[PDB]
Amino acid sequence: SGPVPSRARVYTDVNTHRPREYWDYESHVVEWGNQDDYQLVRKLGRGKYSEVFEAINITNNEKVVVKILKPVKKKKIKREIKILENLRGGPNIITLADIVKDPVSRTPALVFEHVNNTDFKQLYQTLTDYDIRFYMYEILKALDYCHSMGIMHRDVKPHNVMIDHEHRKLRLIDWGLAEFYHPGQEYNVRVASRYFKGPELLVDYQMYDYSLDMWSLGCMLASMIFRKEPFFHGHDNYDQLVRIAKVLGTEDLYDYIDKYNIELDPRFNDILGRHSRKRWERFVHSENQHLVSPEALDFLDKLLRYDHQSRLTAREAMEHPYFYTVVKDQARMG
Numbered sequence: 001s002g003p004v005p006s007r008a009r010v011y012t013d014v015n016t017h018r019p020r021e022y023w024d025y026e027s028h029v030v031e032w033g034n035q036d037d038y039q040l041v042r043k044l045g046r047g048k049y050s051e052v053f054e055a056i057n058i059t060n061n062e063k064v065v066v067k068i069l070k071p072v073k074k075k076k077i078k079r080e081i082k083i084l085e086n087l088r089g090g091p092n093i094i095t096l097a098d099i100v101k102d103p104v105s106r107t108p109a110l111v112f113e114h115v116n117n118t119d120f121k122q123l124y125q126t127l128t129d130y131d132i133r134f135y136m137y138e139i140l141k142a143l144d145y146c147h148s149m150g151i152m153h154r155d156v157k158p159h160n161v162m163i164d165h166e167h168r169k170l171r172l173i174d175w176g177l178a179e180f181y182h183p184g185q186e187y188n189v190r191v192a193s194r195y196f197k198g199p200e201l202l203v204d205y206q207m208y209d210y211s212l213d214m215w216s217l218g219c220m221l222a223s224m225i226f227r228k229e230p231f232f233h234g235h236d237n238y239d240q241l242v243r244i245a246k247v248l249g250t251e252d253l254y255d256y257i258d259k260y261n262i263e264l265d266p267r268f269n270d271i272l273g274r275h276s277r278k279r280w281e282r283f284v285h286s287e288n289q290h291l292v293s294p295e296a297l298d299f300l301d302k303l304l305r306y307d308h309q310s311r312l313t314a315r316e317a318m319e320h321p322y323f324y325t326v327v328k329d330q331a332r333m334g
């Protein structure tokens with residue numbers, strides 16, 4: 001029988017209208033730069049799947065950030081670089097500077113523009129109501145650009161947003177899980193991090209799209225405004241959906257399941273069972289009332305939908321009242 005097909009509502013064929021060499025990363029020939037150009041200064045850390053350094057380009061004396069890639073397949077290597085080259089110059093997307101290779105090891109290393117140590121998770125414990133709005137909007141600028149260029153990020157979370165609090169700057173990093181969106185294509189559910197995985201991924205639905213990132217963004221905001229890190233705290237993949245069910249309710253979950261003719265374990269239905277919906281105001285109480293407004297709760301409600309097709313698009317989200325003053329504020333400064 002199988003499931004019902006799905007299409008992205010926006011940017012549906014941006015790769016179809018483009019030439020083959022745009023999205024066919026398997027046919028790309030990576031002209032590898034010279035490793036000697038770059039000298040490592042200090043270890044900025046090591047991410048969930050890489051090791052990252054502060055570095056200096058000796059050809060122009062500018063600073064760069066080098067990311068020595070995890071022992072990974074050549075299929076993933078080429079996908080990421082091709083996605084970064086295409087997203088270059090986009091608003092709030094980190095820009096690939098060069099790509100080099102170790103002389104003896106032959107392990108690849110992405111080189112980027114220098115931004116800042118400070119990720120958005122470490123900076124989240126000192127943010128006003130207007131700061132949440134401002135930095136969420138900047139993430140939507142990056143999310144609408146990458147969607148508009150035909151790319152899902154697939155790993156949107158606090159750690160992958162770099163933010164310079166003082167200069168009002170923001171970058172979305174780690175595109176190594178991202179992928180090009182093509183209609184009719186089945187996509188692998190093993191992307192993102194538990195707490196930010198959409199219901200589509202947890203119900204083993206393959207034909208998802210850009211809307212996945214909008215789920216993840218909701219997860220951040222929810223945690224940001226209610227100060228519950230993370231807002232949906234699953235222990236395993238089964239439990240994550242069970243936590244989500246305990247907020248959005250099980251009624252719309254099973255409507256989502258039949259609509260797309262999605263199949264899953266009988267015991268999942270038993271595990272989930274029946275549970276009532278909880279209105280978004282019930283996660284407010286003590287030291288967070290200042291962060292939660294009506295426009296925040298509507299916005300959040302419209303992002304955290306089981307049905308991926310119903311979720312707000314990045315552009316739609318940018319038009320929400322939540323940002324009304326934000327878009328007006330940046331029209332007299334930027």
Ligand SMILES: OCCCn1nnc2c(Br)c(Br)c(Br)c(Br)c21
Nearest residue numbers: 044045046047065112116117173
């Ligand atoms: O565990 C700490 C790792 C932090 N980390 N991970 N990926 C990073 C990227 Br890409 C850039 Br660019 C920058 Br600047 C930093 Br800092 C990064």
Ligand SMILES: [Cl-]
Nearest residue numbers: 179186187188
């Ligand atoms: Cl995939």
Ligand SMILES: [Cl-]
Nearest residue numbers: 147210313314
């Ligand atoms: Cl979108």
